[PDB]
């Protein structure tokens, strides 16, 4: 810790956090109606996020 002061992890995102990543890349994507991103976010048991 004389050299590197901050060690910062990056865990795989939560179900609340997989929703927000999904909203950013589906922003310019054009969805119709009757569609639930939270159901799709629950279809990823521990996705990477990328």
């Amino acid at each position: 810790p004389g050299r590197i002061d901050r060690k910062i992890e990056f865990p795989p995102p939560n179900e609340e956090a997989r929703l927000d990543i999904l909203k950013i890349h589906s922003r310019k994507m054009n969805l119709t109606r009757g569609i639930n991103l939270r159901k799709i976010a629950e279809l990823m048991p521990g996705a990477s996020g990328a």
């Binding site: 054009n30 969805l31 119709t32 109606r33």
Partner: protein, 378 residues
Amino acid sequence: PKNPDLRIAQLRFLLSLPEHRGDAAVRDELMAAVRDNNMAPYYEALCKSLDWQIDVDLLNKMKKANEDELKRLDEELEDAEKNLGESEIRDAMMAKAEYLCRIGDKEGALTAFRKTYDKTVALGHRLDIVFYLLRIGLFYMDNDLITRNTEKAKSLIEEGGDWDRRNRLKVYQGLYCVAIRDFKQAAELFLDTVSTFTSYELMDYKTFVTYTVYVSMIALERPDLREKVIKGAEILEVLHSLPAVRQYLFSLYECRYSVFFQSLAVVEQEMKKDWLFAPHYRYYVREMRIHAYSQLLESYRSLTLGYMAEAFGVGVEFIDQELSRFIAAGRLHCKIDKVNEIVETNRPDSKNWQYQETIKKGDLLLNRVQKLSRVINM
């Protein structure tokens, strides 16, 4: 409600101006008007249709009871419960506003609309109010209502929410059909036909197919008409149902002109039963006849009109008088002839068309810099 509501505006028109068309329209409108508690907007129709009948007082106490049932509902609501916006005060007070379009006239409905638009922050509920102004402005064809709220829809609302605007893509050019824009804008944005659920926002589907196919053959003849309406697939499903419309199409494309007029006379007679009708019927047929003449006089430079006596219909003198009106009209670029009886054509060339355009664009800019040079220098 308001979802099948535009059939009424058809039966208002269809009963009114043809008085000979007055047998079955009055039979299923007055019973439909005593249904749904329709009380305000038919007094004008009751002046033009049959005289009077006293169920007015019976439905007035019915229209007052449903008014008073919702009156005591939302005054107790606004005086006890104090959460606002898109809350219970909102949907009760729009139920007053939905009541005054379904039953009442526009005036109580529009002042409830402009009151409830100033209260809300969710633009989807704002756009639904603008959906309601656009529909009641389409009933009474108010040209000043529609110029406002379409600008509300484009500018003031639709920078956000998405794919409920395709409902208005059917409306912006449905208003272009009731105007004289039967030429290019209506055919351009009726071209996306994939919205099939016969809703309030999608008022009918099969008649929408007939509307988008009538307007389509004036925008373009052969700068690839055939890809969008002939090679198009989902348009070809529903015109495979309707036998006369597909016959009306393929007579024009496959160049069978005798059966084309038999289809065209049926279309003009079927055109008469429309409610956005006033710019159609004189202007549509006269444009489609000179439309078919331009491609027929194309590929030829020496046509005898005796060849048009049987490969076209009949009536040697009838072709003669109709070409004579069209050549004198500044259109239909050919020259009709007597006793040789040979319709001779003429067209510009590369040099002749490019000089006729530059002689006009040059003089317009020359007259433009006449004024500009004299605005300056005193």
